[PDB]
């Protein structure tokens, strides 16, 4: 399956198509957007986003604690979409 991912950045709002087996960051880069990252391995907060609608599979994330997850934080570099979703990007500073 493929999902529509709406991305709300500090510049504005976009929507990209992202397969269920593509990470959200990778999908965003393919489209041509410039979202933040460092490790690309789920071990930092560089790529942090906040999901407001929809769901992901971020099973390989290892940086966010349970409360940060509850609040909607996602590590876009290891997050696959599992539905159409909306993710506010550039959220590291929240952490
Ligand atoms: S860039 Fe480090 S967790 Fe995504």
UniProtKB/Swiss-Prot annotation:
Name of the molecule in the record: Ferredoxin-1
Pfam families: Fer2
GO BP annotations, alphabetical order: electron transport chain
Family affiliation: Belongs to the 2Fe2S plant-type ferredoxin family.
Native organism: Synechocystis sp. (strain ATCC 27184 / PCC 6803 / Kazusa)
Keywords recorded for this protein, A-Z: 2Fe-2S, Disulfide bond, Electron transport, Iron, Iron-sulfur, Metal-binding, Transport
Subunit comment: Forms a complex with heterodimeric ferredoxin-thioredoxin reductase (FTR, ftrC) under reducing and oxidizing condition and thioredoxin. Interacts with a number of proteins including RpaA; binding to RpaA is higher when ferredoxin is reduced.
Annotated GO MF terms: 2 iron, 2 sulfur cluster binding; electron transfer activity; metal ion binding
Cofactor binding comment, as recorded: Binds 1 [2Fe-2S] cluster.
Binding site for [2Fe-2S] cluster: 39, 44, 47, 77
Location of the 2Fe-2S ferredoxin-type domain: 3-93
Superkingdom classification of source: Bacteria
UniProt cofactor(s): [2Fe-2S] cluster
SUPFAM superfamilies (alphabetical): 2Fe-2S ferredoxin-like
